[PDB]
Symmetry: C3
Subunit: 150 residues, 3 copies
């Protein structure tokens, strides 16, 4: 009796593994990118930084925080697909010239475009990622593609 | 004996699925879904008249948004606010004027009518819209409102 | 005693996972997907030329929509109708004019050609579109059509 029910449970789990794997592909198409244990997903619209940040946090995630070249490339895929530069999570709102993650931690990876960050006009504390994957500091009030990470 | 090996094998596979799925739930509901209790609301992101909206939801295996508590109403309001578009609810007094019912025919267990509503304005409001402030208003079923289904 | 109850507990967990997964699957497919048998169609919601469309689907781990039966065709037609945009299918006769094949090179097992089609109009129609009425027409691959992938 026990072997009969373990065999049934094995069939259930194998079915679930197959169905779940299929569903993951469906979900990520066309607005998500999985890299390592992280998933980026775009909302497909633009918002100013504060509104974008709230959308991600309320969804149970945070704004895209690429922490390696591989993460940056995956994010860049969404930016290229939508043809809209995106906000990253990181700001120097606390200490000018020192960019940090929302937790307050200093950057462990950067991909700044030449000459950046430059606090242009003395008022750029947010960060956008271009279709070329490079970063530029930009005014937080500008509207950029919303991309969150989970 | 070898069944012990198997049960321990399944425990590991189940743990992986639970964890992987937990992450995908959050991803999936961003930005057009809202979970509340065991219910999930999901917007199509566009507007339709009632009959068309109803059909979309039922064909998808769900039904138009049917908030049955203040908590559900607040969750739905989150999507309405996010989209900045009033939505249809499932409920109508199409069968008996003045008596609003769910698609099953059951009477309301919860309502959040704006003051003075429902008023059957012009003698022809049999559907219900939820505003960005979360209040309800009866409205002509012919009007186009945000499509939000529950699953 | 220990092993039988572990089976019982583990199966309650799997069945709760099955239920949650089923719910999240319905949510996922509303409004841009359709399931039919073991196949799932999902639209990107925009138009692209064939080569671009094909690449999007393959990069996503699927392929362009490839209806292999009347039931599959009807499922796909729902999305086309919902978007009101004709969609590319995966199949082409680029290799041998007049002989439409799937990406694997296999000849068609199902077709739903509109009257008069395929006609290779202008001498250069090697891709396939599906209309809102579910019928197919051969069309120039350079044209832009709704992107619908299957998984
Ligand atoms: O953030 C600024 C801004 O995008 C300017 O338009 C550009 O000329 C600067 O180089 C850049 O630092
Ligand atoms: O009850 C309300 C109210 O009468 C409004 O003034 C009218 O614009 C709406 O259509 C109606 O539903
Ligand atoms: O077969 C069709 C048909 O002849 C249409 O009139 C033409 O507009 C399309 O391009 C062609 O593919
Ligand atoms: Ca500053
Ligand atoms: Ca700055
Ligand atoms: Ca700058
Ligand atoms: Ca009436
Ligand atoms: Ca009425
Ligand atoms: Ca009214
Ligand atoms: Ca040809
Ligand atoms: Ca041809
Ligand atoms: Ca033709």
């Amino acid at each position: 009796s026990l072997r009969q029910q373990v065999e049934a449970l094995q069939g259930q789990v194998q079915h679930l593994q197959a169905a779940f794997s299929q569903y993951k592909k469906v979900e990520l198409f066309p607005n998500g990118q999985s890299v390592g244990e992280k998933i980026f997903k775009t909302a497909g619209f633009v918002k100013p930084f504060t509104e974008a940040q709230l959308l991600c946090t309320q969804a149970g995630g945070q704004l895209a925080s690429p922490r390696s070249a591989a993460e940056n490339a995956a994010l860049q895929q969404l930016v290229v697909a939508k043809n809209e530069a995106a906000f990253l999570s990181m700001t120097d709102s606390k200490t000018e010239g020192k960019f940090t993650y929302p937790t307050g931690e200093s950057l462990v990876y950067s991909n700044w475009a030449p000459g950046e960050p430059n606090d242009d006009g003395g008022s750029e504390d947010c960060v956008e990622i271009f279709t070329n994957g490079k970063w530029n500091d930009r005014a937080c009030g500008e509207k950029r593609l919303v991309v969150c990470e989970f």
